[PDB]
Amino acid sequence: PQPVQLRIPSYGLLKNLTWMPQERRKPKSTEVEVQIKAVPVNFREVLNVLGIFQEYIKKRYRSGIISAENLTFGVEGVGTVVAVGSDVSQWKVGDEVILAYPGNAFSSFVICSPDDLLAKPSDLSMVEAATIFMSFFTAYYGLHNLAKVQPGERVLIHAASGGAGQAAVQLAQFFGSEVFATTSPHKISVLREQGIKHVMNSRTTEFASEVRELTQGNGVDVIFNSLTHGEYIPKNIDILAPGGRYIEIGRLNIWSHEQVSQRRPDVKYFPFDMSDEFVRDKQFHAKLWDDLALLFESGSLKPLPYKVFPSEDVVEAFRHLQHSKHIGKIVVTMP
Numbered sequence: 001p002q003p004v005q006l007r008i009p010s011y012g013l014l015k016n017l018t019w020m021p022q023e024r025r026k027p028k029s030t031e032v033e034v035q036i037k038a039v040p041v042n043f044r045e046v047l048n049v050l051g052i053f054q055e056y057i058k059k060r061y062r063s064g065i066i067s068a069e070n071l072t073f074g075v076e077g078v079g080t081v082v083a084v085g086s087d088v089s090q091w092k093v094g095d096e097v098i099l100a101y102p103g104n105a106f107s108s109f110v111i112c113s114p115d116d117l118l119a120k121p122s123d124l125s126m127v128e129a130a131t132i133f134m135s136f137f138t139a140y141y142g143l144h145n146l147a148k149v150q151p152g153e154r155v156l157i158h159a160a161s162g163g164a165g166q167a168a169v170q171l172a173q174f175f176g177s178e179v180f181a182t183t184s185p186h187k188i189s190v191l192r193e194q195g196i197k198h199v200m201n202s203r204t205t206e207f208a209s210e211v212r213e214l215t216q217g218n219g220v221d222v223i224f225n226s227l228t229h230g231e232y233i234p235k236n237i238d239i240l241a242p243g244g245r246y247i248e249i250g251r252l253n254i255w256s257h258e259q260v261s262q263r264r265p266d267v268k269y270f271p272f273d274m275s276d277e278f279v280r281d282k283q284f285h286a287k288l289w290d291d292l293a294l295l296f297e298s299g300s301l302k303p304l305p306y307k308v309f310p311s312e313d314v315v316e317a318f319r320h321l322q323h324s325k326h327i328g329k330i331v332v333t334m335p
């Protein structure tokens, strides 16, 4: 293929996403070159293009220099090793891999470290495997590592139609918990068909009174939230059961630990940003995959629902997510 990389000239409009020409490089002695086959759009990246959330992680910028014209996209993806640095033993040409937080997976070729790659589950297609990394790693870290969901507990999952939400539903049910889901009105029927008993409208905070009624005022043990505008944070805090665990993956206008404690001192509050975690420790993703890989191997977890767009339609792929037309993941295939 003609090497390209997805870029923008400035912030504010999806239509300015552009496939910019790139040189083909060779890997240095401890690098690996991966030809990308499938790369999904993440909601953060929509916010990035629109100028709503500005990346500070330097890995998201060419040369580590922060500016719109240097911003790259693709916080996860899948592909095939096509060249290996001379001194690398861990990978070989033809290996199929998941890229862990590359930051530039919307590129024809990515050069990275061997420790930035994970073995793709062999029985999944590239597009199927492209649904896994960010959504499941986020949901697993929150539900398992932080909140420690137990069988029988009541777990409220907001925006359960989206990528993180769909992964969280699968994981919560794998852990034997009772899922309460919210989604937009026209997606409720879809989530009920997936087998969720309790599905409510996410587009107002009236779900809180509905949860109170369903639980006879007891509330829920765990909340997995990304909706931070309006009164969504305090309304969620108020429907936590005694000692409930509040997982927050939204990053705009979130409360501090002290603010949450003022309202409910018994609640355990778990805000986090996976991008920060990945940069902090490269063993973090490796240890999560040690737990998750076998679940995808066995079929205990399954790929998310997805919709494919070819690379030439990348603007429409981003718009599909912006307008929230989806269930699961939006996956872009490369030529």
Ligand SMILES: NC(=O)c1ccc[n+]([C@@H]2O[C@H](COP(=O)([O-])OP(=O)(O)OC[C@H]3O[C@@H](n4cnc5c(N)ncnc54)[C@H](OP(=O)(O)O)[C@@H]3O)[C@@H](O)[C@H]2O)c1
Residues within 6 Å of the ligand: 041, 042, 043, 044, 134, 135, 138, 159, 160, 161, 162, 163, 164, 165, 182, 183, 184, 187, 202, 203, 226, 227, 248, 249, 250, 251, 272, 273, 274, 275, 324, 326, 328
């Ligand atoms: N902290 C972290 O490490 C981390 C990691 C991954 C994602 N996130 C964040 O978690 C969220 C999920 O990301 P994603 O990439 O998987 O995207 P996504 O969930 O597939 O898409 C965004 C979701 O937001 C919901 N939504 C947006 N505005 C809403 C509103 N006003 N009322 C109700 N629902 C609304 C949509 O609901 P409908 O489907 O009902 O339209 C949609 O499901 C995003 O906010 C993202 O920034 C954080």
